[PDB]
Design a protein that fits this description.
The structure is a homohexamer. In chain A, the strands form 2 sheets. In chain A, strands 2-7-1-8-9 form a 5-stranded parallel beta sheet, with helices on both faces. Chain A has about 200 residues and is of the alpha/beta class. The longest helix of chain A has 16 residues, at about 140-155. Chain A has 2 domains: about 1-35 and about 95-200, Rossmann fold (3-Layer(aba) Sandwich); about 35-95, Guanylate Kinase phosphate binding domain (2-Layer Sandwich). The first copy, chain A, has helices at about 15-25, 60-65, 85-95, 105-115, 125-135, 140-155, 165-180, 185-190, 195-200, and strands spanning about 5-10, 30-35, 35-40, 55, 70-75, 80-85, 95-100, 120-125, 160-165. In chain A, helix 1 crosses helix 7. The interface of C and D includes residues 155 and 176 of C. The complex binds P1-(5'-adenosyl)-P5-(5'-guanosyl) pentaphosphate (6 copies). The PDB classes it as transferase. The entry lists the keywords transferase, GMP kinase, guanylate kinase, nucleotide analogue. The assembly is hexameric.
Chain lengths: ~200, ~200, ~200, ~200, ~200, ~200
């Protein structure tokens, strides 16, 4: 069958990464996966290539754009990020649900090419709290806070909203959406094709 | 703020009503409730008028039909069942999500009057298990299975499908569908209004 | 071995009583129970004397006051409510934890007679949601909201605060408070006495 | 706001480490953290510096004591261990709940400087069982068993007691204490400051 | 397809019956049920004939014994209790798992007639806690403790042992035993028949 | 006491590995462990020796067989795999429940030497699904599918059956079997020896 494509977006400091990482730890590669994006930003201490991202240089990323290799690409917080079309179409083909961690610009592009992709937006519990999480120079902090408020402007465009106040709760909300989507008729009629045959035949 | 209307259907013995009661005992009345349908069938030991059903006579049921008192109504195995429009509109306007335990016939009439409603169909894990649950004479049991096969055929008309093999597993699937529907933008926009404005 | 006394309070519509009943259905009588208060208010359909309340007449309630039969008592919206001292002392001496669903007035009188008691206050997630839950004429609803705002003002007098936005989330918070109180040294010292001596 | 300071103590072989590690795996760095202590003992296979501990040499640890750099320090099982005051005060300041894994000597020192710190003691289910866990030379085993019995002598000084018989259960007990503490009025009045305003205004 | 018969026993105050009711409220009738025993003891307030027990007179109980109506029967503290063979065989043939809340005496008679049955014995966490739960005059309480110590002595005759210290913990242990028994090859072979053939 | 010996078998692509790995992450080394088997196959990227397996060369494995060092050994998918008898008997002795991940050939050998070992078989939800998981050349895929169908032929020999459709569910089934086994009288009479004494004395 075909897996469902998920778009997950959020301002930095909403917990989106840890939520997605905690999610994957409970799902087998044959059911759920996160997509491997291409980026120009430097790998982070303890972040292997090809796994988290495909780290390429500014020129290398620019030649992929010409090659129309991207399903979408955008400039985010000083670097280029894009979704290799090959991987996404192949993984979805084997029936796997693929998670695309992307900013709102990328989300618009995908909604335009894959109308059935589902989008989830994640909001922090409050401004103060969003601020406390960001801090973890006041000039760089204000820069992240400005980008974070802009990103949140586009929340109403997504199908789902998870307010990540209490971590565990938001992690369950994220699991709950995945499961409810696999309970939809279209996917269930396929997964239980046999049984349905037996019951009506 | 209007609540969502859920349509749940299944052939007898799929475990439908015992899945709903387990769900409801986990939710307060201001969040979720189940509609109390009208019926001409005899009350079973334990059933109380107004609670499980509004048991009426064939004549009375007719009276209500003629006066458009039903959001939907239909005959299910030699008896009538209907959802009084009034009760539903009143509970929906208070923001409560309503569960409608009705057959595939009523489900259709509800889909038209409320295209926003979400419908869930429940299936037994096999025809043998179905048979077992149905048995609770070989003749009466074969006629029950006949009405079930007819119910199960309209399954594709529903948004969600739960194969209730393992009770808890299926109960968590129902709980999951309602939880996910509440995480939808339109619903969330409202209940989190002015948190998004503060942000 | 004496049990802990829990004070739970909230304005009407915060979901207080439906949070307690969900808790109690998860605990045996030798562990947790709820006190059955006395009241002069009319029994609501379903309520049974001795179970939910001990429904008495204004005269009778007065008699008990004059004879110091109440650990605490107060007038809540044109009616009297009180906790008979006797029932409580008897159940507390058997090691059972007791839940007191009472208003901010009774809570105070209980804090003095039992400084060891733990009090939990429950809040609705917003004034709109509060209003919605309260609506269950614009006049009667405004007077209900007025008595709620007055209840919510004494919230800081409580040890714990639960914002009951999502029912299950709030139910697990209550369950969590009672579980954590049982992990306290004084309580644990006793119930694990002679395990610590073996160690 | 200010996060709550936790003291967790236990005789070796009670499971205290694995409980604390399992705990952190479910909490974001912005809510819960374990403090990084200084020690003279050797790092263990697969234990990075600055993360688990700050591994220093005997002389280096001795000069920090003069510098009054420690909130507390003690000698435990042949080595020096201490809590750098800087980190603790800074992390707590950003509202984070910090866990201090320390012996009973350290616990006394902290209770004296931070009267609002909360302490949790963890006991094994029985002596035999404590013994089975220790074993994992009978001369070294008896030495750990003697130190372990001494440590347990000080249990009555802690606010909470978790009997770690069934792991999962003790892990839930440990999560349950953290959550119940964040439900206290003082911390809730701050976290929900806004809402309370709206409801009473 | 025949269901499994579970034997659950314990001394008064171990929390046995409140552990079973919590279990049953989590399972549908086509999966699990509890047998309604016969007894000569007086119905306690709330108990209903046919639901909790089949309350009969000493004469009537005798009549049934003489006519081999009991799969097992025994005297428990000055009264008779028995499991009507008929009800059990009927519910077992429908594939339902049956719970038998009976004493160590009945358990033995059941082990012989159904060697396939699984028996679970429940213990209090200590004699003090046992005493506390039992207290609900020092004389009547000492005689209760005497009958409990005698019950607890036949504990080794059971397949499983649950030390009900923490209610939820013990409830999950019961739930776990039934879930594991259902994962056994013989049971699974059947309910997953023709999935193994497709594979 | 003595821990219980578990045998877990399944055709490749049933999820058996990830289930067992997810299991261990929630159990302390003093309660549950997976046995370290000897094998001739190459270690996999990110798989340390002595931990997952004891990787030896074809000749080295052949000399262990002569030394009767194995409780069982078998040829599986092109390589030799065996269970060192030493480790198993020692770990079980300290009361630990040891998990043996082995094929059906090995399972028969163990059932013959350790009649009280408990065996769990894990089946995929369907043939198609088993196929989807395998794929992750059509000549090598058909080879795994043939071996996988053979392996499944021996399912009826095991005490338990877990159908790993929904991962989380199968993970709970696997936890549920372990716990129910520790609730058996024999093991409980030992674990609660003291209490029982007090209650009947
Ligand atoms: N179009 C497009 N866009 C793409 C693509 N790939 C990625 N993007 C976009 O690029 C951005 C991702 O950039 P990144 O550099 O990969 O960042 P990230 O790992 O996703 O995490 P962040 O942006 O920093 O925020 P986030 O808070 O979600 O992370 P988390 O790790 O949970 O953070 C934990 C939190 O805890 C705090 N914390 C840590 N320690 C703390 C302490 N002691 N006290 C208080 N708080 C503390 C931290 O400060 C942080 O807020 C996203 O906007 C994404 O959508 C693509 O292919 N296409
Ligand atoms: N259009 C419309 N339609 C409406 C409306 N209201 C109702 N309807 C339709 O009318 C029908 C309802 O008729 P009903 O007589 O009220 O039946 P019900 O209460 O819904 O229960 P069942 O038909 O038996 O099914 P169900 O499996 O869901 O019950 P459950 O509680 O799980 O049962 C437990 C199971 O366990 C078995 N069981 C019981 N005891 C057993 C034992 N000892 N051993 C083994 N199994 C045992 C039982 O046989 C049962 O299957 C449905 O098709 C419904 O959709 C309305 O307003 N409009
Ligand atoms: N000093 C003292 N004080 C005492 C003592 N005993 C009691 N009191 C005080 O007296 C008051 C209790 O009065 P009561 O008449 O007994 O009320 P109650 O049973 O406690 O229920 P409520 O006031 O309505 O609040 P609550 O929200 O907690 O109920 P809940 O069950 O969640 O309700 C469900 C919710 O859902 C709504 N709902 C219901 N149907 C709905 C529908 N169709 N759609 C939408 N919403 C719907 C309802 O309106 C309700 O809010 C409390 O303030 C208490 O503290 C005592 O001994 N001493
Ligand atoms: N004042 C002060 N004090 C400080 C400070 N920092 C640390 N300390 C103190 O120093 C001590 C910590 O020393 P450490 O060297 O860091 O030890 P640790 O990692 O904390 O673990 P242990 O002491 O060995 O015991 P624990 O049983 O709790 O660990 P765990 O990993 O769960 O163990 C798993 C268990 O399973 C067993 N196991 C393993 N395999 C087994 C097998 N096959 N069979 C049976 N059992 C098996 C193991 O043997 C072990 O018991 C503590 O007393 C701490 O309070 C500080 O800053 N200030
Ligand atoms: N052979 C055979 N035998 C059969 C058969 N049927 C029954 N029997 C045997 O007959 C006996 C049953 O007698 P019964 O009179 O029916 O008793 P029961 O309903 O089974 O309840 P108990 O004896 O009191 O024990 P249990 O602790 O299990 O109840 P629980 O509901 O947890 O109770 C809650 C606990 O909390 C305490 N409690 C209550 N209120 C309290 C308060 N305020 N404070 C503190 N504690 C309080 C209570 O005292 C109780 O311990 C059992 O030994 C059973 O095995 C049969 O067919 N055949
Ligand atoms: N006698 C004896 N026998 C022994 C001994 N030791 C081991 N054996 C036997 O040797 C075999 C083990 O060989 P191994 O090389 O160690 O393999 P393994 O790690 O156990 O995993 P596999 O055999 O490949 O299957 P499995 O599906 O169970 O793994 P998992 O990692 O869950 O797989 C994840 C799944 O997801 C799929 N996947 C991954 N990515 C996917 C994607 N994008 N889309 C769809 N599916 C995707 C993968 O393809 C895989 O099916 C077993 O048959 C075992 O019983 C011993 O001492 N004695």
């Amino acid at each position: 069958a075909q897996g469902t494509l998920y778009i997950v977006s959020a301002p930095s400091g909403a917990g989106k990464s840890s939520l997605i990482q905690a999610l994957l730890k409970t799902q087998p590669l044959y059911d759920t996966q996160v997509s491997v994006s291409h980026t120009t930003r430097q790998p982070r201490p303890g972040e292997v290539h090809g796994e988290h991202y495909f780290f390429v240089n500014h020129d290398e990323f620019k030649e992929m754009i010409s090659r129309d290799a991207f399903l979408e690409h955008a400039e985010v917080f000083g670097n280029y990020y894009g979704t290799s079309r090959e991987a996404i179409e192949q993984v979805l083909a084997t029936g796997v649900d693929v998670f695309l961690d992307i900013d709102w610009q990328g989300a618009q592009q995908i909604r335009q090419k894959m109308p059935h992709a589902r989008s989830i937006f994640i909001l922090p519990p409050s401004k103060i709290e969003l601020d406390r999480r960001l801090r973890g120079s006041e000039e760089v902090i204000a820069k992240r806070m400005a980008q974070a408020v802009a990103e949140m402007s586009h929340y109403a465009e997504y199908d789902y909203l998870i307010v990540n106040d209490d971590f565990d709760t938001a992690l369950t909300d994220l699991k709950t959406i995945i499961r409810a989507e696999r309970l939809r008729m279209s996917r269930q009629k396929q997964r239980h094709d046999a049984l349905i045959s037996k019951l009506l035949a």
